[PDB]
Amino acid sequence: SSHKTFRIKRFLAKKQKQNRPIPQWIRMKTGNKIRYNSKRRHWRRTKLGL
Amino acid sequence: TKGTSSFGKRRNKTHTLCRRCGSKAYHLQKSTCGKCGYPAKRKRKYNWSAKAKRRNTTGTGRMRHLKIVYRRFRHGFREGITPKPK
Amino acid sequence: GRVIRGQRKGAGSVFRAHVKHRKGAARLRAVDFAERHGYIKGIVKDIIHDPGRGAPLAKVVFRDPYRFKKRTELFIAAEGIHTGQFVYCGKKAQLNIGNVLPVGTMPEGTIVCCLEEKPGDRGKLARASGNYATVISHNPETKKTRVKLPSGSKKVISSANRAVVGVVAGGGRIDKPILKAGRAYHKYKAKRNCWPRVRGVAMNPVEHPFGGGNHQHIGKPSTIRRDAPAGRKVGLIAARRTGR
Amino acid sequence: GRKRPVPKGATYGKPVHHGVNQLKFARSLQSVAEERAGRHCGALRVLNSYWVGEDSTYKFFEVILIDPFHKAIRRNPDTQWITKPVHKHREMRGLTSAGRKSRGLGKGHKFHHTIGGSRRAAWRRRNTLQLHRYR
Amino acid sequence: APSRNGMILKPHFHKDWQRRVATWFNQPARKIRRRKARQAKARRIAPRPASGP
RNA sequence: CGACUCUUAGCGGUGGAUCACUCGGCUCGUGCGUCGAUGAAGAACGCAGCUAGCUGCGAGAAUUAAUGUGAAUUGCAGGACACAUUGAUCAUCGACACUUCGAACGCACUUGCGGCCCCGGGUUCCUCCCGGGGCUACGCCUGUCUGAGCGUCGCU
RNA sequence: ACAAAGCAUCGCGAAGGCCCGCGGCGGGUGUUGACGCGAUGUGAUUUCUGCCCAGUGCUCUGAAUGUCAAAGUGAAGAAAUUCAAUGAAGCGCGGGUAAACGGCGGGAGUAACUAUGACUCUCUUAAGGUAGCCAAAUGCCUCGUCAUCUAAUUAGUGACGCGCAUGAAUGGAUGAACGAGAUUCCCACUGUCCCUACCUACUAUCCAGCGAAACCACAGCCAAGGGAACGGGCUUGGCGGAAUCAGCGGGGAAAGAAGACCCUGUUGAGCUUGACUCUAGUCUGGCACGGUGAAGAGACAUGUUUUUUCACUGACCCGGUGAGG
RNA sequence: GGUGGAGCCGCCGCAGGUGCAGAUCUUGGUGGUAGUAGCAAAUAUUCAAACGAGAACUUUGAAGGCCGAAGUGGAGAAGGG
RNA sequence: UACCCACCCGACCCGUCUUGAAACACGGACCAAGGAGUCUAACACGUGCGCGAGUCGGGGGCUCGCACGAAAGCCGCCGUG
RNA sequence: UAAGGCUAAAUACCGGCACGAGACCGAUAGUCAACAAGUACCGUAAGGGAAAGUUGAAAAGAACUUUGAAGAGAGAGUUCA
RNA sequence: CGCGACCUCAGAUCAGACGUGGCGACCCGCUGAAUUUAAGCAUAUUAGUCAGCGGAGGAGAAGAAACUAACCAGGAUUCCCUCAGUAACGGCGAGUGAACAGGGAAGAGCCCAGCGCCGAAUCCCCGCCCCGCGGCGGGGCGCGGGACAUGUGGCGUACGGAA
Ligand SMILES: [Mg+2]
Ligand SMILES: [Mg+2]
Ligand SMILES: [Mg+2]
Ligand SMILES: [Mg+2]
Ligand SMILES: [Mg+2]
Ligand SMILES: [Mg+2]
Ligand SMILES: [Mg+2]
Ligand SMILES: [Mg+2]
Ligand SMILES: [Mg+2]
Ligand SMILES: [Mg+2]
Ligand SMILES: [Mg+2]
Ligand SMILES: [Mg+2]
Ligand SMILES: [Mg+2]
Ligand SMILES: [Mg+2]
Ligand SMILES: [Mg+2]
Ligand SMILES: [Mg+2]
Ligand SMILES: [Mg+2]
Ligand SMILES: [Mg+2]
Ligand SMILES: [Mg+2]
Ligand SMILES: [Mg+2]
Ligand SMILES: [Mg+2]
Ligand SMILES: [Mg+2]
Ligand SMILES: [Mg+2]
Ligand SMILES: [Mg+2]
Ligand SMILES: [Mg+2]
Ligand SMILES: [Mg+2]
Ligand SMILES: [Mg+2]
Ligand SMILES: [Mg+2]
Ligand SMILES: [Mg+2]
Ligand SMILES: [Mg+2]
Ligand SMILES: [Mg+2]
Ligand SMILES: [Mg+2]
Ligand SMILES: [Mg+2]
Ligand SMILES: [Mg+2]
Ligand SMILES: [Mg+2]
Ligand SMILES: [Mg+2]
Ligand SMILES: [Mg+2]
Ligand SMILES: [Mg+2]
Ligand SMILES: [Mg+2]
Ligand SMILES: [Mg+2]
Ligand SMILES: [Mg+2]
Ligand SMILES: [Mg+2]
Ligand SMILES: [Mg+2]
Ligand SMILES: [Mg+2]
Ligand SMILES: [Mg+2]
Ligand SMILES: [Mg+2]
Ligand SMILES: [Mg+2]
Ligand SMILES: [Mg+2]
Ligand SMILES: [Zn+2]
């Protein structure tokens, strides 16, 4: 928006750190069922919850 | 022109983030939430969509106080005492 | 089936009166010693005109005879009032244009406007743009007076209440034809949303009781009971005659 | 009396429930005063009420309220039953003198509904198939 | 639709029975909740007619 | 024997049926029957050496002390520890702690404005200014103080 | 089509008109006051606006001997009660009103060709269509009749008018300017046409690359016959040669949509009113809050009741102000 | 017979959510159509070099061109994050 | 008998509503898995069994923490009904 | 004997804490959810709302040689497979 | 034109407390339909049900007769079997539809006001000490307050009670 509130900026701060992939050693822990993040977002498709 | 042409002049928003719900439900013109009902003192639950009711009731959050109230009772609700030292 | 326009002028909220730029109520300076015994003074400041009214208003400056200050009013200007004139008020005032008196004092046939229907209500009757009210005859005891209004009806009024002398300024506003639909929209755009009025015969029978038909005809007598329910009560309301 | 609040005559449905004007309220006017009295002062506990005077348009009831947590009530027995949390808002559940009369209970051939606990638990016991384990 | 010499059979299921059906699978466990009380009360008032006054 | 087409079979794909499992449900019993202005339910934002999600937690933040337990934790590091040590870890949990919203509470929801007290710097209360702590919501009870009334009087 | 200026009616002096609201001493018009507000009708200008108040409305200081409830009063009974008198609004009765809804007819004879009929007879009604206008966007018969325009015209324009079924603010007649409004004719123009031709760009076409969908019982050459009364298959004939490319619109009663028509259903909705049953609202009476003082009167009785009228101000109501004489 | 890698059936009785071709059935899968329809709105590309396993499509140079300042140019609002 | 092929004769595509369907009537590309007369109560008749002018069965009661038990057994309760 | 008041026990519990069981279902079944499920995702919003279990016993999860730009292969090896 | 009682009534960031919200299976007040059934439908029915709203508890409500009965009489409430799909309701149609007694589970009863008696015999909050303190209390001492005579405490409440 470039004219943001503070609550709005925090919301984007959290959604922008959830985006990264899974650390590759996680795939090594004992009881795993996780391969790819599957909870990623891409600003062109699935716009934010706004 | 009621579609694909009017779906274009849609810049401004009716709802935003409610400070009590956390949902993108707060009506800005009306200044009430509309999922809990914000300036009203009581939450808008309903006996009238049980599926929406069980989406946010006790247990669906953290219960970060209630979850230890069940712990104390189970043992006796005592306080101001410490187990016997070594 | 629907709720007919005219039923809707009550809820307001669109059919509501358009009053941002209006200069303020056109009142008549409530009473005290000065009105009830003496003849308080005051001078005219200006003749500013308000939107939505054909009569010009006048900011008349008295000075409050109790605290050092300057009360300012808005009188519906009598025709002849000019800037700088001295307007005198009260019981002991003398009878000339722009002086407010109690109708009990002035003789019969006097031509007054901005009259009060009950004592003290600060001016209610005969104040439109070119109207006046003639005083008819007195009645010393029972303190009442008979007064003819612009409608031609005659009303018995208590002799106490006051009224400025003269006629309301701006006479003949109805004489020049509006002459184009623009000047009408442009005219009510200062009063309220009652314009272009659609005749009922053009609406479908769900919107207005005079509707429907394979010709644009009314269908039932256009005169209607005064004891009607809201929604039927449309057309000639409780007409006693009907025709030129 | 009462006036059925529908946004005109406008009671949709069969002409039996068509009524708006003439119907009356189930509770009494006294049990409305006790309610409004204890609804204001949520700390205090309604005890009982009587009549004082009336108008064509008003009825003045007057209500005895008690502070459940003042030591002149907590310590003296025979009045500490109001402290126990069972009695919060007696007049909201219809437990005062006036409120109970609307519930229509008593003993005898007159009060046959409400022969369980109350008018609701009456038929809760009649409209129940008692499907036994053994039939 | 009646057929050929039955009864008239006004059965009361028009209202809504499925909701307020009370099954009795407590029945044998209630026999036991009461039995302990019946015993626990007799042991509590030891010399006394267990049946009551 | 040309290719194509069809049927069948051998194998190979495509697909996920069947089958065998199951830290999950459903149903029925039993015991208990445990919220919140000392601030709940719910929501937000944070917190791991490498950590996104679930979970666990609250600037003392993948836990704190304590008590049992008694040598791990682990994907890789990395480590203290002396495993003759509250002693690694887990369980319990009764000591302590509890970011921001929220009945939410100084007024407002921008995250903005204040007031009143105190204690640091500033001052040498000199007022700001800067920093820090405690109050300041509505309703109502009992008491307390200050009052108002040509209300009833009394004394003057 | 609507709107529109304009014309016109209609209610209303504020405890008002219209109107909202579930409810308040609530709100809109209203920061208003008849040159204002609300409710309709027609639709500039010009020229006009004819008859009808019987019908349905509306309305009227209108008689309410018509009826008519709750209470109220009266009488019999032992009492539930029963029977009396009386009587509000609206209904019944009587006025007004058509720029309210709306209405505005049928027969014979009679003039010097014939015809037509000024003229004269009945009948009916509430008046019986006046000024105008017409085969018009209104005329069934209908390609009405005459003229004009054409070589030729169910078209157009102009006249004619017993007009199935025109016509006066449900407005009549006109009409400059204006119109992406409807027609007709003429000049100019033209590949609209006689009658087609060629040229250009992008396609389609072939190739590399990439690659869908609707649809599909099985399928796909015909004649005739029968047949659920129009076959691809069946009977009898005709015949049949792999795998395909560009086209093509005869056939698959091709696809697309449990037909929008029609009929049924004891299935609905939207709207209407002289359907049935009700309702908000409003008019009127009773009872309650509801008092004080004054006169006076009738009816019954030999006090009661009805109370009519004029005052009062403490409830109640509205008005104003910074509650200032 | 084969592959498959952990459980299973016969008889006497009892109990069922018990047998599918079909419901424009539900869910999933896969064909024929078909390597087909298609990748045709705004005139336009070409040469050389570089990089590279690999160049009609990147990058640099050169040439031809269009947008033509009511822009395909230079900056903002809301919206996006 | 079942795989392929050959021949002679026979032979129209199933489901459905229908007086009548191969129908120029409708559903159906194909294949997997899912998928529709159930339970409760109340009658009625038939049938099997116990007892028989009687016969129960429920609710209670007496016997368990059930492993099998929330079973089985027993009770002037057994007749209050 | 009304117009005032208090009261344990048998009685009810598809929420909660903590358990136990089953002629129940067995991954299109059983709760929507055996998994990061009221999650992903849609809708402005009220709300809507999925799919998705199984290597082996132990990762012993294919070192090395080789072809290829690389994806993929050929040998080799691990394994009861 | 003052000072003083009391009665009304205000203001306190005054001393001390307390109420709101959540859950909502069961529970208690109120509100309250329409699909549906009747082969149509309007009464009826669905149904005092769904939704709406308020309020609680570990259970709630109810509860010690203004009862039942007609008997040689029973004896608070709640639940189960029964009464019984019966008495009654109903376009007497569709349909609706209790109770009493009897058996059993359980079993518990009690307080006021008033009328009176008693020197207000009473209660609250302060201040000092003694004990106790993680459900704030007891004991004593104070011309420390205040409530209360417009009525607190003891006996007493209909089964009778007081004297
Ligand atoms: Mg986008
Ligand atoms: Mg129309
Ligand atoms: Mg209408
Ligand atoms: Mg017993
Ligand atoms: Mg093969
Ligand atoms: Mg295979
Ligand atoms: Mg699957
Ligand atoms: Mg005073
Ligand atoms: Mg008109
Ligand atoms: Mg006329
Ligand atoms: Mg008339
Ligand atoms: Mg004529
Ligand atoms: Mg003409
Ligand atoms: Mg022509
Ligand atoms: Mg003509
Ligand atoms: Mg082609
Ligand atoms: Mg065709
Ligand atoms: Mg029929
Ligand atoms: Mg209908
Ligand atoms: Mg009628
Ligand atoms: Mg295995
Ligand atoms: Mg099964
Ligand atoms: Mg199957
Ligand atoms: Mg150009
Ligand atoms: Mg730029
Ligand atoms: Mg047929
Ligand atoms: Mg055919
Ligand atoms: Mg069909
Ligand atoms: Mg009692
Ligand atoms: Mg699966
Ligand atoms: Mg499977
Ligand atoms: Mg599943
Ligand atoms: Mg698998
Ligand atoms: Mg599998
Ligand atoms: Mg193997
Ligand atoms: Mg609450
Ligand atoms: Mg029906
Ligand atoms: Mg039917
Ligand atoms: Mg029907
Ligand atoms: Mg009904
Ligand atoms: Mg009912
Ligand atoms: Mg409910
Ligand atoms: Mg209780
Ligand atoms: Mg009670
Ligand atoms: Mg009893
Ligand atoms: Mg029987
Ligand atoms: Mg009923
Ligand atoms: Mg006493
Ligand atoms: Zn909210």
Short mmCIF file of all heavy atoms in Angstrom, two decimals, chain B residues 12-36:
data_model
loop_
_atom_site.label_atom_id
_atom_site.label_comp_id
_atom_site.label_asym_id
_atom_site.label_seq_id
_atom_site.Cartn_x
_atom_site.Cartn_y
_atom_site.Cartn_z
N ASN B 12 -11.45 -0.38 -2.99
CA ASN B 12 -11.57 -0.12 -1.56
C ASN B 12 -12.28 -1.24 -0.81
O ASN B 12 -13.14 -1.93 -1.36
CB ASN B 12 -12.30 1.20 -1.33
CG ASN B 12 -13.35 1.44 -2.38
OD1 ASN B 12 -13.24 0.93 -3.50
ND2 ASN B 12 -14.39 2.19 -2.03
N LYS B 13 -11.94 -1.39 0.47
CA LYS B 13 -12.30 -2.55 1.28
C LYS B 13 -13.41 -2.24 2.28
O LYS B 13 -13.41 -1.18 2.91
CB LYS B 13 -11.10 -3.08 2.05
CG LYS B 13 -9.91 -3.37 1.20
CD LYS B 13 -8.90 -4.15 1.99
CE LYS B 13 -8.10 -5.05 1.08
NZ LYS B 13 -7.25 -5.96 1.88
N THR B 14 -14.32 -3.20 2.47
CA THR B 14 -15.35 -3.00 3.49
C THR B 14 -14.89 -3.47 4.86
O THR B 14 -15.12 -2.79 5.87
CB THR B 14 -16.63 -3.74 3.14
OG1 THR B 14 -16.32 -5.11 2.84
CG2 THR B 14 -17.28 -3.10 1.95
N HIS B 15 -14.28 -4.65 4.91
CA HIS B 15 -13.87 -5.27 6.15
C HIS B 15 -12.37 -5.12 6.36
O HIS B 15 -11.62 -4.83 5.43
CB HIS B 15 -14.26 -6.75 6.16
CG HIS B 15 -15.73 -6.99 6.04
ND1 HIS B 15 -16.64 -6.47 6.94
CD2 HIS B 15 -16.45 -7.70 5.14
CE1 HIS B 15 -17.86 -6.85 6.59
NE2 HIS B 15 -17.77 -7.60 5.51
N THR B 16 -11.96 -5.32 7.61
CA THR B 16 -10.55 -5.36 7.98
C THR B 16 -10.39 -6.33 9.14
O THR B 16 -11.27 -7.16 9.40
CB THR B 16 -10.02 -3.97 8.36
OG1 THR B 16 -8.70 -4.11 8.90
CG2 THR B 16 -10.91 -3.35 9.40
N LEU B 17 -9.27 -6.23 9.86
CA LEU B 17 -8.97 -7.16 10.94
C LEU B 17 -9.60 -6.67 12.23
O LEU B 17 -9.38 -5.52 12.65
CB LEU B 17 -7.47 -7.35 11.09
CG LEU B 17 -6.80 -8.05 9.90
CD1 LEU B 17 -5.29 -7.79 9.86
CD2 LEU B 17 -7.11 -9.55 9.89
N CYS B 18 -10.39 -7.53 12.85
CA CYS B 18 -11.05 -7.21 14.11
C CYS B 18 -10.06 -7.35 15.25
O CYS B 18 -9.21 -8.24 15.24
CB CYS B 18 -12.25 -8.14 14.30
SG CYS B 18 -13.07 -8.07 15.90
N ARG B 19 -10.14 -6.46 16.23
CA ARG B 19 -9.16 -6.53 17.31
C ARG B 19 -9.51 -7.57 18.37
O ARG B 19 -8.69 -7.82 19.26
CB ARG B 19 -9.00 -5.17 17.99
CG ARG B 19 -10.32 -4.54 18.38
CD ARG B 19 -10.12 -3.32 19.27
NE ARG B 19 -8.77 -2.80 19.12
CZ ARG B 19 -8.41 -1.97 18.14
NH1 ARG B 19 -9.31 -1.58 17.25
NH2 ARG B 19 -7.16 -1.54 18.06
N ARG B 20 -10.69 -8.16 18.31
CA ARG B 20 -11.11 -9.18 19.26
C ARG B 20 -11.21 -10.55 18.60
O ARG B 20 -10.72 -11.54 19.15
CB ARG B 20 -12.46 -8.78 19.86
CG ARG B 20 -12.96 -9.70 20.94
CD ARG B 20 -14.01 -8.99 21.79
NE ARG B 20 -15.26 -8.78 21.06
CZ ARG B 20 -16.36 -9.48 21.28
NH1 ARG B 20 -16.38 -10.43 22.21
NH2 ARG B 20 -17.46 -9.23 20.58
N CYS B 21 -11.82 -10.60 17.42
CA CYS B 21 -11.89 -11.83 16.65
C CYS B 21 -10.51 -12.27 16.19
O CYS B 21 -10.10 -13.41 16.43
CB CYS B 21 -12.77 -11.61 15.42
SG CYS B 21 -14.53 -11.72 15.71
N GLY B 22 -9.79 -11.37 15.54
CA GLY B 22 -8.67 -11.74 14.71
C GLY B 22 -9.04 -12.05 13.28
O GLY B 22 -8.16 -12.29 12.45
N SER B 23 -10.33 -12.07 12.97
CA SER B 23 -10.79 -12.37 11.63
C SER B 23 -10.89 -11.11 10.79
O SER B 23 -11.05 -10.00 11.31
CB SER B 23 -12.15 -13.07 11.68
OG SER B 23 -13.09 -12.20 12.27
N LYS B 24 -10.79 -11.28 9.48
CA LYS B 24 -10.96 -10.18 8.54
C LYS B 24 -12.46 -9.93 8.38
O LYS B 24 -13.07 -10.21 7.35
CB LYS B 24 -10.27 -10.52 7.22
CG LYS B 24 -9.79 -9.32 6.40
CD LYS B 24 -10.90 -8.74 5.53
CE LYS B 24 -10.56 -8.82 4.05
NZ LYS B 24 -10.54 -10.22 3.54
N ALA B 25 -13.06 -9.41 9.44
CA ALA B 25 -14.51 -9.28 9.47
C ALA B 25 -15.01 -7.90 9.87
O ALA B 25 -16.19 -7.61 9.65
CB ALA B 25 -15.13 -10.32 10.40
N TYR B 26 -14.17 -7.04 10.42
CA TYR B 26 -14.64 -5.80 11.00
C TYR B 26 -15.17 -4.87 9.91
O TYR B 26 -14.44 -4.50 8.99
CB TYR B 26 -13.49 -5.13 11.75
CG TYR B 26 -13.94 -4.15 12.79
CD1 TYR B 26 -13.01 -3.49 13.57
CD2 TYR B 26 -15.28 -3.88 12.98
CE1 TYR B 26 -13.41 -2.59 14.53
CE2 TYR B 26 -15.69 -2.97 13.93
CZ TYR B 26 -14.75 -2.33 14.70
OH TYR B 26 -15.14 -1.42 15.66
N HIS B 27 -16.44 -4.47 10.03
CA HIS B 27 -17.04 -3.53 9.08
C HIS B 27 -16.66 -2.10 9.44
O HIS B 27 -17.01 -1.60 10.51
CB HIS B 27 -18.56 -3.68 9.07
CG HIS B 27 -19.21 -3.11 7.85
ND1 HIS B 27 -20.57 -3.04 7.68
CD2 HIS B 27 -18.67 -2.59 6.71
CE1 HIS B 27 -20.85 -2.50 6.51
NE2 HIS B 27 -19.71 -2.22 5.90
N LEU B 28 -15.98 -1.42 8.51
CA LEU B 28 -15.45 -0.08 8.79
C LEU B 28 -16.54 0.98 8.83
O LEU B 28 -16.53 1.85 9.71
CB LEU B 28 -14.41 0.28 7.74
CG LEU B 28 -13.23 -0.66 7.88
CD1 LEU B 28 -12.47 -0.73 6.59
CD2 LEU B 28 -12.36 -0.11 8.98
N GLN B 29 -17.45 0.97 7.86
CA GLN B 29 -18.54 1.94 7.90
C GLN B 29 -19.43 1.68 9.12
O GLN B 29 -19.71 2.60 9.90
CB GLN B 29 -19.36 1.91 6.59
CG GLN B 29 -18.63 2.37 5.28
CD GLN B 29 -19.55 2.45 4.03
OE1 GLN B 29 -20.61 3.08 4.06
NE2 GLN B 29 -19.13 1.81 2.94
N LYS B 30 -19.82 0.42 9.34
CA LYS B 30 -20.75 0.10 10.42
C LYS B 30 -20.09 0.05 11.80
O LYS B 30 -20.79 0.18 12.81
CB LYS B 30 -21.45 -1.23 10.14
CG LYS B 30 -22.57 -1.11 9.12
CD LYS B 30 -23.68 -2.14 9.33
CE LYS B 30 -23.16 -3.57 9.28
NZ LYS B 30 -24.26 -4.58 9.28
N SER B 31 -18.77 -0.14 11.85
CA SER B 31 -17.99 -0.12 13.09
C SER B 31 -18.43 -1.20 14.07
O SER B 31 -18.28 -1.06 15.29
CB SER B 31 -18.00 1.26 13.75
OG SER B 31 -19.32 1.70 14.05
N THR B 32 -18.99 -2.29 13.55
CA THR B 32 -19.23 -3.51 14.31
C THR B 32 -18.51 -4.66 13.62
O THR B 32 -18.25 -4.60 12.41
CB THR B 32 -20.73 -3.83 14.42
OG1 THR B 32 -21.26 -4.19 13.13
CG2 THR B 32 -21.52 -2.63 14.97
N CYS B 33 -18.17 -5.71 14.37
CA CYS B 33 -17.38 -6.77 13.75
C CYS B 33 -18.19 -7.60 12.77
O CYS B 33 -17.92 -7.59 11.57
CB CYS B 33 -16.79 -7.70 14.80
SG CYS B 33 -16.22 -9.25 14.06
N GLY B 34 -19.18 -8.33 13.26
CA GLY B 34 -19.96 -9.18 12.39
C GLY B 34 -19.54 -10.63 12.35
O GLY B 34 -20.16 -11.40 11.60
N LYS B 35 -18.52 -11.04 13.09
CA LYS B 35 -18.36 -12.45 13.40
C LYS B 35 -18.48 -12.74 14.89
O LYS B 35 -19.05 -13.77 15.26
CB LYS B 35 -17.02 -12.99 12.90
CG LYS B 35 -16.83 -14.44 13.23
CD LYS B 35 -15.45 -14.86 12.85
CE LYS B 35 -15.32 -16.35 12.88
NZ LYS B 35 -16.28 -17.01 11.95
N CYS B 36 -17.96 -11.87 15.74
CA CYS B 36 -18.26 -11.86 17.16
C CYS B 36 -19.14 -10.69 17.56
O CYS B 36 -19.97 -10.83 18.47
CB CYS B 36 -16.97 -11.80 17.98
SG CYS B 36 -16.21 -10.16 17.92
#
